[PDB]
Amino acid sequence: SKVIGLVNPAGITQPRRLTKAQTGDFVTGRPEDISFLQLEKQADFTVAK
Amino acid sequence: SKVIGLVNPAGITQPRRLTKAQTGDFVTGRPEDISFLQLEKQADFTVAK
Amino acid sequence: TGLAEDGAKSVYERLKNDRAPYETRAQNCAQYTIPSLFPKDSDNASTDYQTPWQAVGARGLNNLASKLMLALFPMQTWMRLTISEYEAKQLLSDPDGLAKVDEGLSMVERIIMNYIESNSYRVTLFEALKQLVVAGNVLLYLPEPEGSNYNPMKLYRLSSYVVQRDAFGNVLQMVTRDQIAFGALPEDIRKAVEGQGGEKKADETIDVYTHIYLDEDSGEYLRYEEVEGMEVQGSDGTYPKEACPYIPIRMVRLDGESYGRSYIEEYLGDLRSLENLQEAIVKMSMISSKVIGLVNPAGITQPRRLTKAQTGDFVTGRPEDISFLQLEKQADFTVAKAVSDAIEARLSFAFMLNSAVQRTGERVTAEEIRYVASELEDTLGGVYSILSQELQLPLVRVLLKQLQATQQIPELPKEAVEPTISTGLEAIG
Amino acid sequence: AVSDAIEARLSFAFMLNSAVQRTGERVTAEEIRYVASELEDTLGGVYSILSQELQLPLVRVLLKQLQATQQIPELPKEAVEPTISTGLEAIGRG
Amino acid sequence: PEPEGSNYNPMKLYRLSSYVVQRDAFGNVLQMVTRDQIAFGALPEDIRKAVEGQGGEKKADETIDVYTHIYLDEDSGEYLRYEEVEGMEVQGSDGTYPKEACPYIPIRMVRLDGESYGRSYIEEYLGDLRSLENLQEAIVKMSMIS
Amino acid sequence: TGLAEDGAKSVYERLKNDRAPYETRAQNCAQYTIPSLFPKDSDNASTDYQTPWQAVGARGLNNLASKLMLALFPMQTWMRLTISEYEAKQLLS
Amino acid sequence: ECFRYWIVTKASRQFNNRFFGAPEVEGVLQEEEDEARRLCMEYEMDYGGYNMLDGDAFTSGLLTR
Amino acid sequence: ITLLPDVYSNLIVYSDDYLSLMSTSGQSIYVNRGGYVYDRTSQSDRFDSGITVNIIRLRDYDEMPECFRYWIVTKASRQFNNRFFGAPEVEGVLQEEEDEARRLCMEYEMDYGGYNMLDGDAFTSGLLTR
Amino acid sequence: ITLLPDVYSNLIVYSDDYLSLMSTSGQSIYVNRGGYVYDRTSQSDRFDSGITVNIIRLRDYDEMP
């Protein structure tokens, strides 16, 4: 339950454009550049549960 | 909920033609040029829920 | 003269500052639930109240008022008058005395209800319940009945009236503003305002303030009506606390606050989240419901041929050249909708939206009123327990004394003239 | 998907038929009271509001006109002009 | 209308465009006027002689507007009714309606304070109605392209 | 005669300007539910009221009016005449 | 300034193609011109500030409610 | 930042030091005509009381973040090698070095910016109110 | 760590030693302008009572792990 946006430094997308832009605003960037940190323990959760 | 149109800068497509065009208007561009920023946290959402 | 020393308007304007926070909240609750119900003071006759993006609030507000009114005022008798402090001599002996008074008390109650329904009290009471849910509180005033006339009870919105309370919770003073046209003024008021000076047209609107205050000398409540700073002579009168026809009713009481708070305000922070989520969903669909043909410039296909050609016309081109702009937020749509559904279900039980038995009611039934009543206690808190006690009982007291002078009272022994009153569920059986 | 969702909100607000009243081939007092209760569940209280503003005045005017046509056997005006109740109490025998 | 005997007497319905009303914040009616355009031949006999008494030849198919104004008398709380044709009051048409029993029944579905008129039930859900209008319009149009 | 001093002609005109927002609302509301119920002043005999793109408003408007009529005005009695010659003495004596 | 750089780096690449061809200089200037072109696009989107919800002609009327 | 016009001339100077001139809102309405700021939407280059805009202003090589200094050098190193003594062996290395230099500078940019999508965001901040 | 201005001048020095300045929490505001610490948001290069920032300072080849 924690949001962290992992911006790929080799990417073109810059968070300053994303945060300042309003809803439905065209922003220069690429979707693969933006990613989010995720907990990978899916197998560990099902065995623990 | 927030909509952000991530336009690939290397792409042909320009947002000016997209916005000015009426409904059912042919606009020079490519579909893969335009993309939208999405929150990809699905594993986190399902484990938290 | 105590509180009335400043006047009726000076105290009214002085107390606006305390009323202002409650007005702001009441407008906010309205904005997300049927905004026409509580309108802003500035807005009038050209407002075009915008519908909320979410419809749970408007549906929930109507449901709570409908459910409350069913339990609060059932079709069957909902008032019971009981006698105490002398039942010892009346219960043990005199079997005939008990039968006579019970019929007599039943005579009063049925006559009371005929006055309620014939005078269109129910239609005004339902309006109060809707205003209680969205706004903090409402004041209900019962004017005296004169002769044989149809006199609807007068409800006052939170903006119209003011009332002051201490930490104890009793009413210190209350002031009410009322807008009446000069032509519509009664005989006493119109002659007084004309004596003030000038000529008033019929369409001209003036404000009247009725101040009800607790003088230091005695516990009686004195009320006076003033027009443009001068009191009309016939307005002055002294009323006891129990028999005051000016009834301020608060749904959610807080210690040290003169005003109640709305039920919705606890969920208003949640309808705000629901409205934002539903606002984006419709706006995303508005983007989606747009046709843009993305022609690949490196392609062969030219839109001039496609548009000019008739149906079933061979046109030189390639299908891959033509493409259409699409909204890509598929993952974001399902997460936003998933949260919105969870919020809606959360609000469903809060507003009593889902109830299978309550959905189908063919007629009013004694057990059904109790079942409606029980649900208002299991959920929704104890508003029925508290709001009705602040509402139903004072209406019975004030109406009883007003009608008792007008109505004929037979020979009734000792406490039978003034029986103890039970309301709500506890009077159903 | 969105248009269907919007339709659901409007269908409930306008009381679009869900076999609530379409079922049945007869009109009875019980069905009328069922609709009267439903009209208070939704639509705020327009059934009550119209009862004061439409149902009540309409009776009062016709009562005066019908008074001239039919002479009430009882001379007193109260018997001539009885108090009028136009709510759910009017629906049904009593 | 008045029963006027056993003859058939239908209720007359005035659309919001036809009539007008003024109210105070109290909710009571101050003054109100209804506009009725009726052909000269179809005019009532009392109205017909008034128009003829006014002067000027009128064709039968030509329609003359009639105004029925009821207002509170400032001296006494009684409704006063009169009709005017072409700015001239109809003689003998003047009458004092009984207090709070005038045959005109102004009706507002939704009552708002400080507002002389009333609002429809649809306007509460007009927005959801027009949003559905936009969505279904595009759905049909996309089917037209296909 | 202060209210009628201008005459019904003038008082109609000034107060008509008050109802101008309301007839605008009704026309806008009608445009989406059924354009026929509330038509504009200008259009007449050649209107050709375009159908709404959604029929929910039309389907709901007719249903709403019908439901009201059944409860408000059925064939059964819908006014109750309650006699009270006195407030309490009528039944006693 | 974004466009002034692009014009120069485009003219610089054009200069050696036509008149005096240097293979390694062309290789880099091609990459540089693509990078310069990309930046001028980002300038235009930042300058334009185009909005699909309210900015555009069509959807703006739809959202008004 | 506020650009102030000369009260006598009434027009602002758009000097070459101004790398970029953009309006704070979504749509930028200021362009250059004759070296002076020009309002294209208003068809007027005469301003009164000044304007509020977003400007990128040129700085020296110093008065720069240190993380950016190596990227400036590494890019300039590539061109300088390319223009005068173009050696493929060193050119390949510098291209790899420049890509790492850009990666670090973006890493600096996110660290410096501290952008928050929940509360720093213009749109989303209003939504989080409860 | 705090940076204190000169009492008379009210200016802090952005020395060549300082490899980076960043604000403690986020959205770093202090930037170099003319060799002195400049607060871009407040548009003032004059400070009093000092400022609290995160500093990377140069060290020798030694003193490094």
Taking the CA atoms of chain G, what radius of gyration do you get in angstroms?
A: 19
Residues 6 or more apart from I58 whose CB is under 8 A from it?
Answer: I17, I19
- The SS3 of residue B23 is coil
Partners of H19 in beta bridges: none
Closest CA to D35 of D49, D53, D21: D21
**Could you tell me if A45 lies within 8 Å of chain B, comparing CB atoms?**
yes
Q: For residue B32, what is the DSSP state?
A: G
**Could you tell me if B21 lies within 8 Å of chain A, comparing CB atoms?**
no
Residues E125-136 as b or e (16 or more Cβ within 10 Å = b):
bbbbbbbbbbbb
**Cβ-contact C399, C117 below 8 angstroms:** no
- CA G63 to chain CA centroid, nearest Å: 32
Q: Are strands A25-28 and B4-7 parallel, antiparallel or unpaired?
A: parallel
**Cβ-contact D85, F82 below 8 angstroms:** yes
Alpha carbons C87 and H1: distance in angstroms, whole number: 85
| Count of CB atoms situated within 10 Å of the CB of C342 | 12
Residue of B nearest to H27 (CA): B16
Least CB–CB distance from C291: residue in E71, E113, E145: E145
Residue of A nearest to H121 (CA): A19
Alpha carbons G38 and G56: distance in angstroms, whole number: 24
- The SS3 of residue I32 is strand
Chain B / chain G CB contacts < 8 angstroms: 39
Taking the CA atoms of chain A, what radius of gyration do you get in angstroms?
A: 15
**Could you tell me if B48 lies within 8 Å of chain C, comparing CB atoms?**
no
**Tokens at C414, concatenated:** 């000792």
- Report CB contact under 8 Å: G65, C51: yes
Q: Which residues of E touch D1 (CB under 8 A)?
A: none
- Report CB contact under 8 Å: E26, C178: yes
Q: Which residues of A touch G46 (CB under 8 A)?
A: 17, 28
Q: Calculate ∠ Cα C230-C175-C18, nearest 5°.
A: 125
- DSSP H stretches of helix in D42-80: 46-50, 56-69, 77-80
- The SS3 of residue C153 is coil
Best to test chain C binding among B19, B26, B46 (most C CBs inside 10 Å): B26
Partners of C181 in beta bridges: C205
Closest CA to C81 of C55, C52, C113, C59: C113
Closest CA to H32 of B2, H40, C278: H40
Q: Which residues of E touch C45 (CB under 8 A)?
A: 115-117
Least CB–CB distance from G45: residue in A23, A24, A27: A27
Q: Which residues of D touch C288 (CB under 8 A)?
A: 2
CA distance A13 to chain B (A): 8
**Could you tell me if F25 lies within 8 Å of chain E, comparing CB atoms?**
yes
**Cβ-contact D41, C64 below 8 angstroms:** no
Alpha carbons C25 and C30: distance in angstroms, whole number: 9
Which chains does H contact via 3+ CB–CB distances below 8 A? Answer: A, B, C, G, I
Alpha carbons E120 and F37: distance in angstroms, whole number: 13
Half-sphere exposure of F1 (CA within 13 A, CB side): 6
CA distance F48 to chain C (A): 27
**Cβ-contact C330, C324 below 8 angstroms:** no
- Report CB contact under 8 Å: A23, C280: yes
Interchain contact A/F (3 or more Cβ pairs less than 8 Å): no
CA distance E94 to chain F (A): 13
- Report CB contact under 8 Å: B9, G51: no
**Could you tell me if H60 lies within 8 Å of chain I, comparing CB atoms?**
no
- CA C11 to chain CA centroid, nearest Å: 25
Alpha carbons F81 and D79: distance in angstroms, whole number: 9
**Cβ-contact C214, C221 below 8 angstroms:** yes
- The SS3 of residue G44 is helix
DSSP letter string, H8-55: TT---B--TTEEEEEESSSS--EEEETTEEEETTTTB---SS-EEEEE
Alpha carbons C3 and C209: distance in angstroms, whole number: 14
Alpha carbons H70 and E91: distance in angstroms, whole number: 102
Q: Which residues of I touch H62 (CB under 8 A)?
A: 32, 35
Q: Which residue type, as a one-letter code, is found at position C195?
A: G
Alpha carbons C249 and C257: distance in angstroms, whole number: 13
Residue of A nearest to B32 (CA): A30
CA distance B13 to chain E (A): 23
Best to test chain E binding among F25, F31, F41, F72 (most E CBs inside 10 Å): F25
**Tokens at C41, concatenated:** 């003071």
Residue identified by tokens 């598929």 is: C330
Q: Resolution in A for the shown PDB structure?
A: 3.5
Q: Which residues of H touch I36 (CB under 8 A)?
A: none
- Report CB contact under 8 Å: D6, C282: yes
**Could you tell me if E138 lies within 8 Å of chain B, comparing CB atoms?**
yes
Alpha carbons C326 and C324: distance in angstroms, whole number: 6
Q: Which residue type, as a one-letter code, is found at position C104?
A: G
**Could you tell me if G28 lies within 8 Å of chain H, comparing CB atoms?**
yes
Q: Which technique was used to obtain these atomic coordinates? A: cryo-EM
Q: Calculate ∠ Cα A24-A29-A35, nearest 5°.
A: 95
Least CB–CB distance from B15: residue in G38, G45, G58: G45
Alpha carbons C280 and C336: distance in angstroms, whole number: 9
Least CB–CB distance from C292: residue in B1, B18, B35: B18
**Cβ-contact I19, I58 below 8 angstroms:** yes
Q: Which residues of A touch H121 (CB under 8 A)?
A: 18-19
Least CB–CB distance from F25: residue in E31, E71, E120: E120
Q: Which residue type, as a one-letter code, is found at position G49?
A: G
